[PDB]
Amino acid sequence: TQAEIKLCSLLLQEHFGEIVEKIGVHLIRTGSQPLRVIAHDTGTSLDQVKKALCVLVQHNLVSYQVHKRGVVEYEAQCSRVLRMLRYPRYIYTTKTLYSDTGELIVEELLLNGKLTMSAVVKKVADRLTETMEDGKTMDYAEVSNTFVRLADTHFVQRCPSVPTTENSDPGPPPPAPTLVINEKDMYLVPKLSLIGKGKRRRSSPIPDDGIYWQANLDRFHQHFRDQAIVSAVANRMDQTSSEIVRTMLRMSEITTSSSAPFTQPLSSNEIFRSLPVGYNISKQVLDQYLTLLADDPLEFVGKSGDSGGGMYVINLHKALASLATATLESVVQERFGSRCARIFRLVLQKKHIEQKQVEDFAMIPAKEAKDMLYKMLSENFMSLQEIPKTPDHAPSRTFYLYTVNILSAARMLLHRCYKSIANLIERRQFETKENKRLLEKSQRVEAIIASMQATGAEEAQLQEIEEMITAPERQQLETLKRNVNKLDASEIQVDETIFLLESYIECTMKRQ
Amino acid sequence: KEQFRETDVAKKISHICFGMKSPEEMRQQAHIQVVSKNLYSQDNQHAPLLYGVLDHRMGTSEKDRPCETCGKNLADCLGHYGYIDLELPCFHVGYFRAVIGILQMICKTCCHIMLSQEEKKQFLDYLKRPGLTYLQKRGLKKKISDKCRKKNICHHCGAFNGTVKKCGLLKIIHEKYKTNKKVVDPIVSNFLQSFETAIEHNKEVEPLLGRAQENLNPLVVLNLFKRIPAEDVPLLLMNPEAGKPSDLILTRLLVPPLCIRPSVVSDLKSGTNEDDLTMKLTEIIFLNDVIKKHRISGAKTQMIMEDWDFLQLQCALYINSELSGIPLNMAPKKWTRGFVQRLKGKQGRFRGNLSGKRVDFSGRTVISPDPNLRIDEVAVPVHVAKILTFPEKVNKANINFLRKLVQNGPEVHPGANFIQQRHTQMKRFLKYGNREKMAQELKYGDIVERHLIDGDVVLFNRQPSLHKLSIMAHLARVKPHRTFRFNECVCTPYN
Amino acid sequence: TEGRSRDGGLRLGEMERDCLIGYGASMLLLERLMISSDAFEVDVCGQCGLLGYSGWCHYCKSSCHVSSLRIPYACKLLFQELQSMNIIPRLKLSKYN
Amino acid sequence: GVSECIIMGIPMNIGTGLFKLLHKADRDPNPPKRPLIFD
Amino acid sequence: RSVTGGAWYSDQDFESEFVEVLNQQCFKFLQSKAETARESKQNPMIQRNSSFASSHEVWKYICELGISKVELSMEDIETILNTLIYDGKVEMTIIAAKEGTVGSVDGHMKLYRAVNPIIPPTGLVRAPCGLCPVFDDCHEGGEISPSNCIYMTEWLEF
Amino acid sequence: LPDVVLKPPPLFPDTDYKPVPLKTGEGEEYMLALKQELRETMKRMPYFIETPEERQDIERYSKRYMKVYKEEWIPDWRRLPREMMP
RNA sequence: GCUCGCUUCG
DNA sequence: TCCAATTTTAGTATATGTGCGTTCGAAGCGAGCACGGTGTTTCGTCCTTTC
DNA sequence: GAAAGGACGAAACACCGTGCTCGCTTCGAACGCACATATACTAAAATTGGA
């Protein structure tokens, strides 16, 4: 996981600083370790180690556990540091599904990690008072309504609460309070009757204290998986099937967990009555849609029962496997061409196959199909079976069969995407550092205008800004800006493939 | 004006930290890339080719042609390495056992180590203790390997992990789809039934469907090692700063400088004398070129894998020229000297060049009895005394003696042969030039290579040594005869 | 070299080294096996631990941490051969004090 | 160890190299320091 | 036909242009049929059935085209359509039909339809790092570095 | 037999396949702008701990004018173990 | 000059 | 529900095919050094026909 | 007895494959001794079945 460690290092350096990213990388590479050995191995002062650990545990990046002799050990969550990159996508999806109020709520929750409901509603009101003008004030009522609406949909979840010290072992305080998680009050918001109005940044006791909230990334991952499945089935059959499967997944969201081979089955009557009335679709049309989706060779849905009219179920693991297969065939096509993608799909459909059979089934002339096969072998896109006639395993007396393993190829592609995003971040930081001189020059020449904006603002300071030598350098500035924009766009768009591969790898494990 | 930089520091080596180099570090350390399989040019001068083997940018091996990287002669050139890229990765014969061990330690699907969280914490706490020794490290590795081989299913991803063993030579087989006498799992049944097209097009696949386990070629092994989490690296008893699991599989070969590969220009015939390492590297480059040619021309998979196995075998012979599992048809015709053979043996580097090495300022002569000498004195012939010289520094005490010694010259027995000045280190031969002027200009601190005279402490030894008394330091007395003479009473120690 | 026809010198074998060890003469053993036989001065970089040339490290592309060091030439040959065998010896130098 | 001392070309710790020698030079440890007037 | 001759082989020379023209014409015909089926919008089942094209139908269409002089059998067009399926552009379904104008397979008929790809090109291929052939030799400090990369330089310049 | 090569292969070999252009739309641009805003706003956040500057040359009257002032968040010591208190 | 073999020497 | 039999499950304990060693040196010589299999370019020398 | 234009053949670079004309093919260990890895298999623990 060297690429993962490098990506986490880059993210922590760009987001938190230097003295904290070292502690984070040490925790990721060495695992759970007490505080003193961490401070000894890192080589910095104890106070910096404490500050780094506290700022990491605030954003739920690391956790602390008790062990023998009452020692506390800190373990980092590399998965959480990787999910940190998905913050823009989380904000975009919470702005799409909800209003801008929930957008600011999720933004503050991600930027602070753990906060109380009063604090987040106060911050959201203070930030939204700037959006509007003309003396209109922001009340806490609608903000609390949006917060509880996010809560009941499991998008925001209460942080693990420390048990009561008086009731649980009253006496000597333990080194760690041993925070536990309770599912009863996991999504129960507190009753806060206090309201207020946000201030407009003029620059001229807590009822919900102890109750901290955070963003439930599992709900966002489930929503992204549902959106991906809906987009896939829309590209496959039609938008009507996409709406049907969207309604089915919306019904299944509550009654199912985040990891299950099959969801709870639904009947045709409840799917019909739950479908939005905007579609002029009858019962028989829905029955035909369901029975034609069940006959799809992709197995997105399944019958799995006949009671209650049309009883149907949705295959989540099969859909994720199909999405991973589509991603792999797409990257193969874009990296080696359409003919190599044809050979890949041939060797994927046929579990085991040889060179002559590949040439016969793909109709690709010799000296070229073998070349693409060897190129895919050199990139770990497939593995040879190598069935031996004799245990000597001599090449002249054995058969070589080509076979694509989806799991290993998906892991390799995920590692490649991690290293790609790491290289993109490195290139962006290099371009920023090499041009920091022009950046400071432009910042100064623009702060000349930013200073004395209204008070003592003579017009004689507007025709001298572009008089300097910065005007021919504005072209280099624009090139740097567009390069950074494109790098960030690519880094964000690779995160979708990363999410797909990570979901495929997670849902195929048992964790026994 | 002038920046202060230290000229020389009395640096003393504290300890040697062994480790491994990644292919990127191999590229960074090397200066040039060797791609030409030939040695010399087509012209009659037979100059070494550029970017090929025997190139002078990687040091020099001839007294006339200097190095191209550093402008120094053969005596001052320390040598430079090169890097050769391989089309297909090959297992390192030295770390092949380590490769098998690591493959047995970690899972073959998620690359995680076969250890539960409690066992992971226990092993980490056992390893975090200070003063960990080599024996303790090897014992911990053995224990963790046993506890990993005890398990059969993965606690991280849930994939099955069968036995991993060595089949043939430099080939690894993982028994993922093992035969189950009880109710069979769905995975093995799906694997068996996935051969439908293969059986339809080739019936021979059906009888040989059994024993079809996973074959871990260097590509898949390298891909798995590149995805190993850094947290599990200390659990493999391998130092993270020393190396990484991906370094065990070699993709670049470090061709050594010309100092390790001396070349003899035998002008008596139309050929040159080269060591075995140069020929092995030439064969490896030729195999890489042949593999590339077959990949371009679209050859069959059987011959491609045969060329890959031949390249692996040639790399192993370049590393260790004495293997056991070499096939008879793939066995070498002649005998070559690999690095292992150059290291081990009675004539190796450790025993022949490190523990015991030849020195100068020494002689060997037949002995004869002489009872008229003391037991702590030994007679040295005049002829040997004129050759074995001692460097005496000119001081305020022996100035008038060294003056007369220089005046006598290298012909008279009491005298010297060379004078090294204090300011300049240019030696001066006393056989030429006015010796009187040199004697009159003997400054304090000069070195005079005086002849062996009476009173000099000299080691005297018999080469067959049983105890320490076989070699003793005596006082040299010069005699006109030609034998080493000493008191016979000291005959019993020397035997 | 080895032979008299090749004008070679005598060889202090392993047992001679054992006798010199038993006597405890460390300076004489050092002068015989290092100074008088295969003495050389190499350049080692204190950052990466590799061998440099002419006070320059090609690996790190710097020369501030390169320092001279006395060594038997056979030891340098062994280090180079080990580097060829992917067994990289990293030398951590320090002051003699 | 002795073998590594012989290989690396450094004096071995056993024998005469177990101890260190000091020079009985005319000196004065902790010499008088020039006083600082401005501080 | 296996040891010598064949509709594709001409004087021991594989005709790549011929199979390319066949693939292009078959894909154009299937795409036009799917477009007509979509624009018909009479009924989704009827639309899917009309978008389907039998092997005999496309074989007769190719024979009507007459691109080459060599006679193309039905199984030749079937193999061409299978290669098109392997290209990720069309989809084939085996339906049950006892007898009809095709009569090729006993009780089974293969219907082919042009289908759009599942997803657009991924974000990885839009970056030079994803299509680099020397991606393995990438390193921070060395000859091949992202700072001095030529691929990303030409990509940003373009 | 394969031919001999006089010069090493290029450090960056050319490829006939180019990366697919990035997806366009209001969503991608909004996500890019939001990521840039997060980059700009998270460095000034008190969670972003900077390297403590040291080795001040002299003390001056202008120190109070150039003294960097920034509010510091107070961690909840109830949840955090006792070992991280200053 | 490298290697190997024989041969002697104590 | 409880005592007896079947299985499995790992550990242990006796083999049998591997890899590693086998004194210090010193001095001479005789040999051969990677090549060879033949396909092709070049040069020369000599079967008859000409003075 | 000297000569010449054309012809053959003999010798030395040199491209290709891989030290053996074909595909075969042996013997002997060199001798001890500490690691082992395959098998094998023994016994007991555990759980299903009959009374």
Ligand SMILES: Nc1ncnc2c1ncn2[C@@H]1O[C@H](COP(=O)(O)OP(=O)(O)OP(=O)(O)O)C[C@H]1O
């Ligand atoms: N192979 C060897 N290893 C070590 N030393 C040897 C060897 N061959 C000879 N020597 C030297 O020669 C000496 C052997 O002589 P030794 O055996 O005591 O008398 P000898 O040869 O039996 O004479 P006699 O036959 O008794 O007249 C001792 C040893 O230093």
Ligand code: SF4
């Ligand atoms: S050369 Fe540049 S673009 Fe290509 S893989 Fe390396 S860093 Fe990425």
Ligand SMILES: [Zn+2]
């Ligand atoms: Zn050099």
Ligand SMILES: [Zn+2]
């Ligand atoms: Zn696993």
Ligand SMILES: [Zn+2]
């Ligand atoms: Zn260095």
